Amino acid sequence: MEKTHVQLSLPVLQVRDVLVRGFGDSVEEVLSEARQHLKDGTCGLVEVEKGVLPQLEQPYVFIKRSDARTAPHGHVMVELVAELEGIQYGRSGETLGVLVPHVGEIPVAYRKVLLRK
Ligand SMILES: OCCNCc1ccccc1
């Protein structure tokens, strides 16, 4: 029943509000946990600016733009890419943000994406 892509609206969190600053301790774990939280509706997004990544925990999970032509509704097509110690696991387009668990923080916006699953 699982489609290749799912439309999600992700809460955009300010980095200083985030209570759980990463998904886990290895590349494989963070990707796994990020995908589960995305399915459960408990994933937030932090937009990357100077100073943001040092305030979060590695490995990082990024959502990156996967294509240039399809934004049905306002949902940019994205895929997950993890980073640890300067090495990325996946190759994709431009970063839309870094994913983190969402545990009830108040967002500043919602970001519509079409997530490749
Ligand atoms: O083992 C999967 C259970 N999820 C634990 C968790 C992680 C981050 C925020 C809230 C809860």
What does this structure look like?
The protein starts with a strand and ends with a strand. It has one helix at residues 27-40, and strands at residues 5-12, 43-46, 60-65, 76-84, 87-89, 95-101, 109-116. A hairpin with a 2-residue loop joins β4 (76-84) and β5. Strands 1, 2, 3, 4, 5, 6 and 7 form a 7-stranded mixed beta sheet that branches. It has one domain (1-117). It has 117 residues and is mainly β. The chain has 1 helix and 7 strands, in the order βαββββββ. It binds 2-[(phenylmethyl)amino]ethanol. 2-[(phenylmethyl)amino]ethanol binds at residues 20, 101, 103. It is classed as viral protein.
- The total strand number stands at 7
Overall body shape: globular
What is the distance, rounded to the nearest whole angstrom, between the alpha carbons of the first and last residues? Answer: 12 Å
Total DSSP helices: 1
| Bound ions, cofactors and other small molecules, one mention each | 2-[(phenylmethyl)amino]ethanol
Q: Which assembly state applies to the chains in this document?
A: monomer
Amount of beta strand? 35-45%
Number of domains: 1
Major sheet description: 7 strands, mixed
Query: What is the element string, with H for helices and E for strands?
Result: EHEEEEEE
Structural class: mainly beta
Task: Summarize the amount of helix as a percent range.
Answer: 10-25%
CA-based gyration radius: 13 Å
